[PDB]
Amino acid sequence: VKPIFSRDMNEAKRRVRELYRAWYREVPNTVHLFQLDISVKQGRDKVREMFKKNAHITDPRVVDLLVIKGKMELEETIKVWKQRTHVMRFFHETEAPRPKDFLSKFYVGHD
């Protein structure tokens, strides 16, 4: 069909599963080889919240592009690349962070 991408509907879901195992094994390895930073358990919780935002699945075309991107930004650790605890860090350290409420945001006055 058009266009190919990589997988058709059901096959695209199992490509995410293979991607999930490869990244789950690296988070204990990126403590001793990289840096302690936060925690091994807290690093694994960062994985689950990342896939929840990506969880929609309507077409295999969108899913396949996420796999290629998932084998790049999460690949920035496996083959040993320089980051120095600045790159590949997803969580905000200095975030305020803002909340969504008609009493909290309106008191600060924004938009």
Partner: protein, 147 residues
């Protein structure tokens, strides 16, 4: 009382004599930084030595443009430097992004990564104007550790 005030100037004279800068080739500014070596305008062995080295050097010149890729890279160089360290932001890109600025990749100000003591405003920072940056650094060192 009199010996205390005069000995402090003698330690400050040691840095007034010689300053070893870092040779960062991260700019068009770096070619003008190579004009400091060019005989017509020289601080070479007047104070400047082009040996550089990441650890032995006292001064580091941030030459021009810095990207978000080089932002963690230049920071770890600053940590390797000894305690008497002076940072010169030679070039308009180093001062706050001469060009680009509003761009996605270029870091604005350099002070967001590494604190700056002496600012040089010039894009093609003329070697004549570059001579001020080292001479002002030598003049700025006045008094260190009273008590």
């Amino acid at each position: 009382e009199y010996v205390v005030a005069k000995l402090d100037d003698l330690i400050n004279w040691a840095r007034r004599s010689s300053l070893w800068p870092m040779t960062f080739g991260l700019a068009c500014c770096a070619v003008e930084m190579m004009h400091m070596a060019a005989p017509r305008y020289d601080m070479d062995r007047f104070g400047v030595v082009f040996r550089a080295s990441p650890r032995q050097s006292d001064v580091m010149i941030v030459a021009g443009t810095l990207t978000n890729k080089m932002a963690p890279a230049l920071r770890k160089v600053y940590d390797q430097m000894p305690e008497p360290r002076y940072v010169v932001s030679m070039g308009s890109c180093a001062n706050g992004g001469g060009y680009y600025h509003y761009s996605y990749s270029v870091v604005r100000g350099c002070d967001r990564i590494v604190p700056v003591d002496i600012y040089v405003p010039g894009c093609p920072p003329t070697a004549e104007a570059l001579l001020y940056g080292i001479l002002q650094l030598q003049k700025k060192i006045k008094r260190e550790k009273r008590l």
